Each structure stands twice: as C-alpha cells, then as structure tokens.
Design a protein around this ligand. Sequence first.
Ligand SMILES: *[C@@H]1O[C@H](CO)[C@@H](O)[C@H](O)[C@H]1NC(C)=O
Ligand SMILES: *[C@@H]1O[C@H](CO)[C@@H](O)[C@H](O)[C@H]1NC(C)=O
Lengths: 48, 49, 49
Amino acid sequence: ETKCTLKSFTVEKGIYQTSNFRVQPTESIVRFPNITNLCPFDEVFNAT
Amino acid sequence: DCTMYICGDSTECSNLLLQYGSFCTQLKRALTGIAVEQDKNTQEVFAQV
Amino acid sequence: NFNGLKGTGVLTESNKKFLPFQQFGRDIADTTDAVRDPQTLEILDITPC
Ligand SMILES: *[C@@H]1O[C@H](CO)[C@@H](O)[C@H](O)[C@H]1NC(C)=O
Ligand SMILES: *[C@@H]1O[C@H](CO)[C@@H](O)[C@H](O)[C@H]1NC(C)=O
C-alpha cells in the first residue's frame, strides 16, 4: 500500500500516510413518510 | 485528506481526482513539511541539553 | 434516502430530540447530519464514515 502511494518499488525507513478510513458501499435503503389519507378510489370502482 | 474532503462519500470523485495529476502529492508533501517542522521547532528551543 | 435525502453513511440513534416543527438537522458545513425518521417518530443520527 505504501509502495503504491510512493509510486516506487522501494520505500524508506519512516512513517508514511495512505488513504484514510472509509467503509465501502454495500447496499441502498429508501424510505418515506408512510401511507395515509388515501385517494377515494373505492367509491369510484364500487359505485352503486 | 484530498478525496474524502472535496467529495464526501462519493466514489466517482476518486476517478476525477487522479486525472488532475500530482496536485495532491504536492499538497500532502507541503503540509507534511509544516507537520515535521513543528516537531523540529519545539526540539530547537527546549532541548539544548 | 429519506424522502429525497441523498447520501451514504451509517445510521445510529441520537439521544437528542427534535421539536414537532423540526424535520432536518444541519451543522457548520450546512448539510444533513441528524434527522427525524420519516415513517416513525424518533431522531436518527447519520454518523459518517
Ligand atoms: C368492492 O365490492 C366488492 C363486492 O361487494 C367487494 O368484494 C370488494 O371487497 C369491494 N372493494 C373493496 C376495496 O372493499
Ligand atoms: C405511520 O407511522 C406512524 C409513526 O410510526 C404511526 O403512528 C402510524 O400508525 C403509521 N401509519 C400507518 C398507516 O402505518
């Protein structure tokens, strides 16, 4: 990893720095305020 | 850190940052020059003995 | 994606509570960090990476 960072096949005796912490993406979630006050379709297909 | 500051939690910016070249190699090696000098400044004033 | 809140991050429970007129939450960076949950009444913190 630090050989990849330094763009060389040899590194020197010392502290270096690589890419920081990041949790890789796994999935996606979607949610929304739940279903209320539905449109009056029961009247318009079950009309007497 | 370059990638996760200018583009937080977006993996498409990792592709667009590498094609700008050695900007972030220069900027990281610039601020490391300060970050090693501050150790040298404190050792210069106090540690003559 | 909380009704248009696009972004990626991990989700924790926040001890603080919002007022009934409040739905979102900002920070110094002016972005979403802790919001009220859409379909259930508790406050969820978006902990970043
Ligand atoms: C519409 O009417 C039919 C017949 O009475 C019934 O079976 C059906 O359940 C009704 N629709 C709804 C949504 O209740
Ligand atoms: C919607 O969510 C709220 C909060 O959890 C709950 O009180 C309500 O009963 C829910 N309604 C439906 C139709 O699920």
